[PDB]
RNA sequence: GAUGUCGGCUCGUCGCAUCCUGGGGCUGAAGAAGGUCCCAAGGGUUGGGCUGUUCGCCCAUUAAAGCGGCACGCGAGCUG
RNA sequence: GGAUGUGUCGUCGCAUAGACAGCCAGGAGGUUGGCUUAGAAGCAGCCACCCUUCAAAGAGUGCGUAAUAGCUCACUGGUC
């Protein structure tokens, strides 16, 4: 969800996925193949989503956090100064960035719940599994 | 009559038959008929 | 996929042209099909053979076999299809080739039957259909079908012979 | 696995079912173009723990094993390879594939087996005498249980190049 | 056959997860008299196919196997 | 160097995301009464009490008492 | 978001040791698996998915009544 320690606010710019790998921590995982800005609650959709589908366990790999501040238009007006400090916080996601992983369930369990987290998303998702040892 | 703008499969018995310009469904059970207008 | 055609007895197929006119005892029927579909006799009994191979002509190839296969059965073998009349009261006369039902609906229901169709009554409570063209055949019990629907309460109305229906049930 | 061409400019490679590739030792770091297909079909069976000779277009064998695979980011498709020559004697720090034996008696409670780390390095392990995996029984393990590098069985003559320490397997409660 | 099992180690009701916490344990010689019992019914063989027919109940309900083969 | 502004009245016409009628599919649709969705704009869509009111609340009815566009339709047409 | 629309390259597999579909026959016995509960018996929810007989049958898929039964699939044979 939100930061605890920060600036205030922020801007805005794109081009595809700095630092997003394949397989780290899980052994399925979903990611962007599109850009956006995803805002805290679709993480948060997305998450709920998994957890309800995997009952008991817990092996959801968030590899996202929002940390881009978003702001806010108070009713109307311009004649004032730069706004709404707390709108919504964010993650730029780019294509390639894998956005979540699973552990301990099956291919066909994870199949599912990634279509199940994807419906809740901004953007076209991918499923995927193993093969990327780059650097470790 | 049940216009849902999206026709999947629910159950081992659905049937999608293209007709006059749309997604259709002929389904055994009669609540599961599906249509896109 | 769809090849061979029986071709039993008294069969006086004319595949000449367009005009795939085939005669028979039963009555001479007359049907229209494809010309860039090849079909005559290479032996015994009867095939339809296709040129292309894609998707267009392998929808137009299993038509036009059953098609003929329909029409050579209508020649010799014929059609006749067996209607049941279910619920209370529920019964049909004939007044000369006129099918006259009463289905519970305030005013009787009179049908005719079109040019090569003809309708039977042993019992009552039984329609028989029989003619020559299974589609007009089919056409045909089809209206009479749709005079009474079974019901999803009771199965009441017009049902083919051997019909399941199931039922739901409200009280 | 057959290369073929080897020019700077990867124009003529590039619209065709062809993949870059480079392959080095220390005397000679020539320049290389080989298969998509062949390469996957061949790569998803091998890895790291495995090796194939490349005979370039003029008859030329030469053993190699993969250092380092380069994929595009928006498609999974793989864009360039880093073959390592083999010398014969003695090689390199190797990462090998850590798999799991038989259900634990700690996942029955409502425990999972969470492979920590899903490729070790090891030094000094000997070249052609390179395990194509390295098989760990988790029977033993229950919930809190964590298996460290200086507690795995090893094949003949390889050695640790991670910490011994340092958590490879462990059985996680639910949750 | 739940009649046989709840009188033999004296269970009550029985077990939610027989994975987390068990219940009790049953000898070899007790899975005889259940093979005596209930044998009108049963289309198994000889001594092997009642054995381990009538042990396989014990996993689900929470009574741990005794003995059996090998060593 | 002027494009009169709410509400009423008068006069209309149009969209359909249909209030009534018309045709349908599903119903947790026995029947009668319905719910919901699909097709459907031909015609129809009442009179009063309160408020400048649009709205809204109320009385009494109704097959129904639809929602919106037309310079929040219409002052060289009226009111004020 | 959805789709047996057509065109073309690819990746797993079952297959004349006779498949995928239609057709005739069968589909276990422990066992109404235990627990949970007013019941929970293949089908409101946890743990497991072990065993016999064998040409074969998963402590089990969808429907069903209040739980049973019912009606079929996973698996097996015959004709193509
Ligand atoms: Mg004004
Ligand atoms: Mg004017």
Redesign the pocket.
């Known amino acids: 969800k939100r930061t605890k320690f920060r600036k205030q606010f922020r801007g805005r710019m794109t081009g595809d996925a700095k630092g997003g790998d394949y397989v780290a921590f899980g052994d399925y995982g979903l990611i962007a193949m599109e850009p956006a800005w995803i805002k805290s609650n679709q993480i948060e959709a997305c998450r709920i989503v998994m957890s309800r589908h995997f ?2 366990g817990g092996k959801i790999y968030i590899r996202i956090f929002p940390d881009k501040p978003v702001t806010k238009k108070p009713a109307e007006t311009r004649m004032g100064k730069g706004k709404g400090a707390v709108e919504y916080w964010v993650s730029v996601v780019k294509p390639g960035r894998v956005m979540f992983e699973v552990a301990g369930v099956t291919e066909e369990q994870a199949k599912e719940a990634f279509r199940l987290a ?2 809740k998303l901004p953007i ?2 991918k499923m995927v599994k193993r093969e990327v040892y780059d650097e470790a | ?3 849902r ?5 629910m ?3 659905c049937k ?1 038959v ?1 007709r006059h310009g749309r ?1 259709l469904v002929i389904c055994s ?3 599961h ?1 599906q249509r ?2 | 996929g769809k090849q061979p055609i029986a071709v039993p007895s008294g069969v006086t197929v004319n595949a000449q042209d367009g005009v795939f006119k085939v005669k028979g005892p039963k009555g001479e029927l007359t049907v229209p099909y494809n010309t860039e579909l090849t079909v005559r006799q290479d032996g015994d009994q009867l095939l339809v053979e296709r040129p292309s191979d ?2 267009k002509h392998r929808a137009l190839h299993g038509l036009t076999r059953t098609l003929v296969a329909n029409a050579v059965k209508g020649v010799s073998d014929g059609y006749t299809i067996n209607l049941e009349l279910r619920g209370v009261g529920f019964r049909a006369k004939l007044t000369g080739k006129a099918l006259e039902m009463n289905i519970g609906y305030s005013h009787p229901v009179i049908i005719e039957p079109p040019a090569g169709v003809t309708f039977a009554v042993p019992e009552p409570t039984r329609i028989d259909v029989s003619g020559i063209d299974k589609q007009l055949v089919g056409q045909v019990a089809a209206n009479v079908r749709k005079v009474r629907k079974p ?4 199965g009441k109305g017009v049902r083919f012979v051997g019909e399941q229906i199931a039922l ?1 049930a ?2 | 696995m057959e290369l073929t061409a080897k020019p700077r400019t990867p124009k003529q490679k590039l619209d065709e079912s062809m993949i870059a590739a480079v392959a080095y030792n220390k005397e000679n770091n020539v320049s290389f173009a080989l298969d998509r ?1 062949a390469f996957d ?1 061949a790569f998803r069976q091998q890895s790291t723990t495995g090796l194939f000779d490349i005979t370039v277009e003029g008859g030329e064998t030469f053993p190699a094993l993969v250092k380092a695979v380069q994929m595009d980011k928006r498609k999974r498709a793989p864009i360039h390879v880093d073959f390592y020559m083999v010398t014969y004697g003695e090689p390199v720090e190797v990462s090998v594939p850590v798999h799991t034996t038989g259900r634990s008696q700690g ?2 409670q ?1 425990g999972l087996v969470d492979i920590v780390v899903h490729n070790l390095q090891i030094v000094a392990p000997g070249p052609r005498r390179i395990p194509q995996e390295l098989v760990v029984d988790v029977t033993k393990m229950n919930i809190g249980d964590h298996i460290t590098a200086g507690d795995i069985k090893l094949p003949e003559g390889c050695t640790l190049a991670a910490d011994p320490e340092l958590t490879v397997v462990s059985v996680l409660p ?1 949750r | ?2 009649y046989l099992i ?1 009188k033999a180690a004296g269970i009550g ?8 916490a068990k219940v009790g344990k049953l000898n070899w010689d007790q899975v005889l008299e259940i093979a005596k019992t ?1 044998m009108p ?6 001594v ?2 009642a054995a ?3 042990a ?2 014990a ?4 009574v741990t196997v005794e003995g059996g083969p090998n060593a």
């Open positions: 009952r008991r994807g419906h076209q998702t | 009559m049940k216009v703008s999206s026709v999947k499969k159950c081992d018995n999608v293209r997604v059970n009669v609540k008929k896109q207008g | 894609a998707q019901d999803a309460y009771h739901k409200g009280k | 297909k079909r996942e029955v409502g639910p | 056959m739940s709840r009701k029985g077990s939610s997860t027989p994975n987390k209930k019914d049963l289309n198994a063989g000889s092997e196919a381990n027919t009538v396989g109940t996993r689900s309900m929470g």
